[model samples]
Target: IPASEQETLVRPKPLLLKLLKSVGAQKDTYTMKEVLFYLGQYIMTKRLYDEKQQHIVYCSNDLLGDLFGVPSFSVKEHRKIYTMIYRNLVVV
Candidate 1:
């Protein structure tokens, strides 16, 4: 279990990993990447102009920082997070 060690793996089945679980996640179990993925998705959607679902939050950088608990980023900084989203979880 050394930090530098690695394991090769493949999913045995279609593992249904919960996207945040809606039950506030098990803090002890959910990995860091999972949280980042969910946040990144939300941040991307909220910023996009064509996304106008009634529930979407349309937040400013300060607002997002307050909500997401990460340091606020400028508009340009948002691009980095969206790239991170793709890297962390999904294509969209």
Candidate 2:
């Protein structure tokens, strides 16, 4: 098979767990409605972490939406999450 058709190295649940850990750190800041909304967003976008920053990121909102969609995640927290996911993705 072509490399382009190859599957991802990492699966979704670990990344989802990382997101869950961060978001759950402040459960009080958000409601169940928002939780379901963001859970859907995370599922939609989580696979994107496997892409390079250029493909995954376009503006601050992209990163912001990815991270802060869960809770009171600050700018520093956003950067940390972005860098961690972005860096991990590019590696084999």
Candidate 3:
């Protein structure tokens, strides 16, 4: 696919996709927008927020922890999560 393709689709590597699967995402390739959408929904649905802060995402799952390199992060750092996952995605 060309760099200027209408939609830039990316294929997620194993660990990132594993978290996605826990949220029922099965498509082999996903646009960045779709990937972010899935991630937000996953976090929201899984209630990964910290009980104390409520706005912080306390990641106990090894999959996400491996990506973020930390168990806890502010929800506002979602961009970091998105970029980290995006870095692992291969353009397809």
Candidate 4:
């Protein structure tokens, strides 16, 4: 198998589906890597970076706040965002 093809796939739930679409991920299923890629892409496009700090970021949108349960957070908390959203994502 190709290296890129070796990945754990996940099923995006309703809220995750909405977030994925916003990042142009228009697909029902995707590898975890791909899902995170879209998510990080969305963050970049939304300019979530905090002006005063490099390792901190703000939610910048309703969906992110709802997903992560925070308005703003540091890199430590940001790392856990995926874990939070992981609950609703079905591993396939």
Query: For this target, which candidate reaches the highest lDDT against the unseen true structure?
Result: 4
Please write out the lDDT profile of model 3 over residues 5-92, one tens digit for every residue.
4267898888778878877658888887677777777777777764577577867674566676778777676556655666667888
Clashing pairs in 1: none
Off by over 4 Å in 2: 1-27, 48-92
- Candidate 2 on 22-85: residue-level lDDT in tens? 4444342333334334544653464433344332432234443454343223223444444444
Best-to-worst TM-score order = 4, 3, 1, 2
Query: What are the clash counts of all predictions, listed in order?
Result: 0, 0, 0, 0
TM-score per prediction, in order, is 0.31, 0.24, 0.68, 0.74
lDDT of 3 at 6: 27
Better TM-score candidate (2, 4): 4
lDDT of 1 by residue, 1-92 (tens): 23221221211111212333432343433333455454556456556322355433434453444433345443345445444333323221
lDDT of 3 at 12: 85
lDDT values for all models: 0.38, 0.39, 0.70, 0.73
Clashes of 2: 0
Give the Å error, residue 73, model 2.
28
Two-way TM-score contest, 1 vs 2, winner: 1
Ranking by lDDT: 4, 3, 2, 1
Q: Which ten residues in a row have the lowest lDDT in candidate 3?
A: 1-10
Predicted model with the maximum TM-score: 4
